[PDB]
């Protein structure tokens, strides 16, 4: 397993240090390579280091502007990203490589959000979605940054029909989703179902019920 | 840096059926393909490394081909668990670069969308905007046209729509419209009509309310 | 003896660096690690001078380490081999020391003049040794270019 820290939002400008804590093997063997997916995009190749020989290679993108590095001591590797741009948001992965015993990016870490934005971090409005034989009733989460948002429905006992919808970018650059149950229109008036609202970047928890 | 074309940009197929994606390089990376497979929200899983060889653990439905320049990733019998996008990449030639990856959803029966319409809060109007929402749920394919209508006249660049990923049971999608418009605009107008068109429909269908 | 200092590169970009005393091994260098890229002594030598086929002799410079061709399990291999300075460089040097140099397209191979079809190969995978390869159209890097120095 190849554990991730340090992502996060950022001004444009500013610097992060990104870590990959290695557990199973000595990373000494091995090149660590970097990986990063801009939202809704693909992945794109950023650097690698042989902790070993210390060689380090970069993409002409991060070349000058972010460092590669490892403590074997550590068994951990790094990203120092500065003069960080809005184009570097993404997902940061990294991965092992070893050649001679067929290891070719066979291990990735779960990856850490890097988004860059000078935007304050605000958190979400919840507004019940009210029904007007299965009902449909859900919430809206507006206006709130960065990403992520999570939702839940009756502190996570209600599962089954939930829809959570990706979020949306505004133009007022605030990102907005719905998440939305079908459940028996029978059961609407005597149960309560509450939306469980969660915004670890702000520090927000919201719980709003779909009252009819 | 070379250029790995992947085609095609998406597909379909059912389970057990068989689909082979196609990865085209600028120059010749000789053998240094690998193949990756990236459900939602996860890190790539290895798959082929060296354009044929199959990493550990991996089913043998699984298996790829190369010729220098042209890639093939091939699966013989769709399982369940195969709702992911698929990436080549070449290791030969740095910077190592991915293709821009294929999206391969389960096919089913057609399904017609359960339309519902929802107006706005009591307490969002007291800031001063609305919402009017529109849940399009469980239907397939994912093409589907949403229409806002607003006392019998067609709205156009205020609303926006979000759509799921395929449904773990039954691999049907959702879609949420939102229209929005500030107090301004919304109190002005009486009738709010949301007009959904699909393949499991036989003509439109319209949900409604008024304030 | 006509013998020339160079720097080789296989077809993928591929330099050539020292790991361990008696290893080279093939990786992707950029900026001041592509100083650390080992520089060969080609040396040209004595033999059979077919069409494209020039006997040529590879050495370290200042390390006295030759490429050499030895069996191990009755299987040819790669391996650097410790050299008494004051004698070689060498006209007729030994069979093991000797390989050919095949000019196929605009790329250069090299072929082992005492086993036949076995060439100086690299690995794709980065930083994997160079060793000799048994054959010529497989999944390996048989075919380099060539950068002088002086």
Known sequence: ?212 | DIQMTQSPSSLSASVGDRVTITCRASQDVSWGVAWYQQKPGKAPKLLIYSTASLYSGVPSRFSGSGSGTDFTLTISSLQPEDFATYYCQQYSNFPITFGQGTKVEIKRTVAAPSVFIFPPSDEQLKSGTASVVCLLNNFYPREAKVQWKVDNALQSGNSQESVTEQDSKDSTYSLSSTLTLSKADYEKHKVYACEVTHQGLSSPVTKSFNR | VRSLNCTLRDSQQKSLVMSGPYELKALHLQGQDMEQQVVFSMSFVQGEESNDKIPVALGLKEKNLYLSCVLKDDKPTLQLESVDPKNYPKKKMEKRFVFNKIEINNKLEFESAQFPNWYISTSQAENMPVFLGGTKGGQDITDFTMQFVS
């Not at chain 1, 779960?110 to 409005?125: F, N, R, Y």
Request: aromatic content about 12%; hydrophobic content about 35%.
């Open chain 1, 1 to 212: 397993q190849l554990v991730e820290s340090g992502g996060g939002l950022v001004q444009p400008g500013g610097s992060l240090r990104l870590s990959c804590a290695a557990s199973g093997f000595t990373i000494n063997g091995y090149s660590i390579h970097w990986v990063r997916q801009a939202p809704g995009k693909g992945l794109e190749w950023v650097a690698r280091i042989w902790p070993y020989g210390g060689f380090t290679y970069y993409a002409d993108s991060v070349k000058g502007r972010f460092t590669i590095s490892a403590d074997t001591s550590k068994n951990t590797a790094y990203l120092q990203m500065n003069s960080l741009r809005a184009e570097d948001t993404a997902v940061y992965y990294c991965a092992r490589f070893n050649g001679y015993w067929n290891y070719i990016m066979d291990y990735w870490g779960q990856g850490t959000l890097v988004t860059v934005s000078s935007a304050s971090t605000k958190g979400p409005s919840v507004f019940p979605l009210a029904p007007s034989g299965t009902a449909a009733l859900g919430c809206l989460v507006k206006d709130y940054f960065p990403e992520p948002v999570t939702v839940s429905w009756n502190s996570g006992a209600l599962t089954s029909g939930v829809h959570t919808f990706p979020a949306v970018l505004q133009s007022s650059g605030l990102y907005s989703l719905s998440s939305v149950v079908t459940v028996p229109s029978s059961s609407l008036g005597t149960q309560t179902y509450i939306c469980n609202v969660n915004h670890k970047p702000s520090n927000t928890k919201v719980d709003k019920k779909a009252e009819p």
